[model samples]
Target: SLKVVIGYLALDDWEFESLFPTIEWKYLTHINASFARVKADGTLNINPVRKRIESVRETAHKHNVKILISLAKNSPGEFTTAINDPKARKELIQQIIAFTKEYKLDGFDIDYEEYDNWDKNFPSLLVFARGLYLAKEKNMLMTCAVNSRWLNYGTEWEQYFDYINLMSYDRGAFTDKPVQHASYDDFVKDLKYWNEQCRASKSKIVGGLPFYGYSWEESLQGAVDDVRGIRYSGILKHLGNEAADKDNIGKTYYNGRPTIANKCKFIKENDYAGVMIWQLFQDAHNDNYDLKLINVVGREMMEEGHHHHHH
Candidate 1:
């Protein structure tokens, strides 16, 4: 089947009770617990949310889904320190290996979305990956959530990743200009870039789609101060696609059913490995019989699933 990697945040709005038994889990190949503690001391702290995580793990295993823990910042500067120091990096790597083995998890997904010093600390990342790669437990999956910009990720660091989920959405979050939260063309362009960059013509990439959108007051000149980006669910109804508060002079942008289907089409046609979603909880289906974002992508993948789908 066409691969699908979904990152789920253990937030309050959604429940594992609703999600784990839902229709989305059927299409997911990997269900990543959104975040785990990556301490500045170079240790992985999972105990605080251990009980909650175990619940996700239990449900995922029941669905035959691979459960991966997302390792990211526990505090403000933890991700940076963990990557920069050799001792810290070594300890983090050891913790990753040990913990995954302890929980019998499928693997760990690295999200360096924290800390801004990647340009200088980039080499230290290689050090961390090499440590994980050389570990005794080699079958576990290793992947990452890369930033949207076309980073100069040469072959040296690419080997450690099984799939690189491109964060293509949140278009206006970083921009001062108002833009479509996620359009088809942008998603297509990212897939094309990674397909070409992947080594040996092997597809190991996931197209990241956002369930949320950007909301801002319509202004003559859109500035960063006027921009507000948040989850689409609060603005757009679970079943409805788009909503505009013309009276309030506010607007929100998101990918509706058609765009969702088209995105799935682009993924299948391009032979990319799969689709990755930022937050699974932000999507829903209304009584109007509109498709959930996950359903469209899932059905599309199911349709073309036989197309060289094996890893």
Candidate 2:
């Protein structure tokens, strides 16, 4: 079975150094740079403000963890240009190959969102993946974050990528329904759907767990407020101080410990690949009290014979 992989968003070198020691090395499997940007013209760029490639390599190597780089071409808006223009799309793939060679990264995580159904965006994505596979000599990882509904689309690209990270969060964002960011039922259903669609095992999929939450309030547009703004520590502090109502507090989008553990249990029982957290720094405090939410879920997954606990 594959191990549960913990990732840290090294925004910069300082952040990496400060949070490195706190990371439970045994649970840590991969470290990814917060972001690497790709221009509309297909020019590649790393996070200017974050740790350079060399520093990241050295730090990750010291800890014995594989390093991944996030490549976003107009992210949060999907790979719009790449899907539309074949030339730019090919250029983007070439740039990614070059980046992998230059930085010696173990893999690339593509985060494209909010794409339309037309233009066969799904197949285009696989074409890009095929390019990456052809360009690399060694076994290089190509992972992607896709919308949950994509499971129902029946696309051919499903079998191409090595691993798929399901964006199980944000289901309740557009709807008025009060839902968990990482709902147990939704996550399982989505995973199963992909497994059936691709005629593959769930072990090739990684459940995308959210380390954030959402805050909703009644506005002119009817219960419109912040989305993906809640943090684990922040919510804990709020609940502890009695500054916020217990019912309304920690009731944001993301799943709590119980839900996470249940999901983890399902993953283990069903033989799913593993779980990956959105970030690592969000839990940069002592376990049990400070970062209880993530710590508990992670511990349950890492430790043997641990059952899910509801607070």
Candidate 3:
């Protein structure tokens, strides 16, 4: 199983380095650097976070962890512009490829969000993925973040992407009505649709888990109107690890340890690629905490896989 974590790029210089010695790194294969930028002109830049990343590169290397970066544009049009012109797309890919080579990154992640839904946007997206596919041939890893709402064309994606990181969270709450963000039912529906319906290869699929939760911010075990998110880290600072995973913290809805473990079980039993936490740093720090949310999947899945007798 591939245990991966996504980290915001501009975090403290030593943030990842500090987490390096923690048990978390032991469970992680990839630390996907969240959000470098596609410059307004269509070239890519990691300027804001580049120095901080440099601080952790060697530390991450010591642990043999792969670093992948996600880059998106300032606007949908920037990416569309980059892909629409051959010279423009080549320059964009070249800039990104240069960054990957300069940093010796493990892979590249595509997350241009608004382009997924329209039939008009589909052809451009195809060209965009195809551009990155060139880098993949030269051993640059290629992955993509997919919204569960927007994967109608996913089966055709495997030709370019190495892994499809399904954005499974936000489903339960992002809508008008409040709902469980990453519930078991949500997993069954979305994941099953991707695996069985889209017919994408199960191994090429990476199950997404959220390190954050949303809130209507009203009451316990009830709906809070005007839903907003409260990250795991905030939940931690306010209530620590224990309370963060409990029934309802003042109207916050989150994935607790049990729910996370259960999802890992489903991922393993169903032959899916391992879990990918949305942002690794979004959780509370627990030196002696039992809930070890991010680390749970490695133990949970392995234990079940160890005892399962298959035909």
Candidate 4:
């Protein structure tokens, strides 16, 4: 089988509806309907933007795409308190299952993070995972968005997880110079580091790709950029069509179409599960398929499929 493609969609983006209908779902295998937050008392703060959730589910099912809700820690202590307490853990798991059933979702992705103490929380995190894994029905899938650093814990995370969504982007320079945050070589190193820490089957590992880029103030030296993240759409809009071929516009580096294409080919060749974007709305419009990062990924992965036909 060919590799899978996944994308995360956030609930708070005001223009989400405008972008929602424009999403190229034909290339996506799953969508993480994001951050149904965890409250202090172990309950969920899922402010389901009723219309958006409904529309996403409807359109996703029409395209035969699996939809999963991501659970994230809303505050500093929420995740730690919720998972560490036995009673709260039970309530949390119950709420998760109830939410999934209510939404007609395929499964859940654990995005629980930002704990004060990993040493203490790590064990409790497993306890919660074991509980949820045992509680869920047969067909529900379990996945997690994780950094390469956490893979060092040596926990048997794959026992409960169906896929490991590697958050490989946003990583700063792997060397001395201030350069491409999500460089091609850095991606290769992330994959290699992931393998070194956790020897999960290649098919269960999904590499993360960014549809956005960081604007570095100092290109040649390591310095923080104050302007923050820029979406691929923003990049193209500001720099015009020529920026499509280049990786950066004055030190603001992003994974251009060619970089994305190379990563996709590497993923397929290495038998990695697939690539998952941080957020789908960050991609450029599909009107220019060649300039769209998602389309680039789709082309690279799907071109070899027997069913695909080129014009």
Candidate that would win on TM-score: 4
Q: Using lDDT as the measure, what is the rank order of every candidate, best first?
A: 4, 1, 3, 2
TM-score to native of every candidate shown: 0.83, 0.81, 0.83, 0.89
Candidate 3 backbone collisions, by pair? none
- The TM-score measured for candidate 1 stands at 0.83
lDDT values for all models: 0.68, 0.63, 0.67, 0.79
**lDDT, candidate 2, 134-200, per-residue tens:** 7755767777666655434354656656667777776656555655555677888888777876555
Could you give candidate 4's per-residue lDDT for residues 194-244 as a string of tens digits? 666666777788888998876654532332334466778777876677778
| Residue lDDT tens for model 3, 173-286 | 766465677777877677777777677778877788877787665432232224576656566655556764463565567787777777888887777877777777655566
Order by TM-score, highest first: 4, 1, 3, 2
Cα deviation of 157, candidate 1, in Å: 1.6
Worst 10 residues of 2 by lDDT: 217-226
lDDT of 1 by residue, 1-311 (tens): 44665655553334445654454567677877767789987987776557777776787788788888777788888878887888888888888888888878888888876536656777777777778888737689888887644565555776788878888876555565556867788888777666665451337778888766765545422422244655444444422334422111145456666777777777777677878887887666343224466766677876456555465
Model 4 residue 226 lDDT?
A: 43
- For residue 249, model 4's alpha carbon misses the true position, in angstroms, by 2.6
TM for candidate 2 is 0.81
Provide C-alpha RMSD values for all models, in order.
5.0, 5.2, 4.5, 3.6
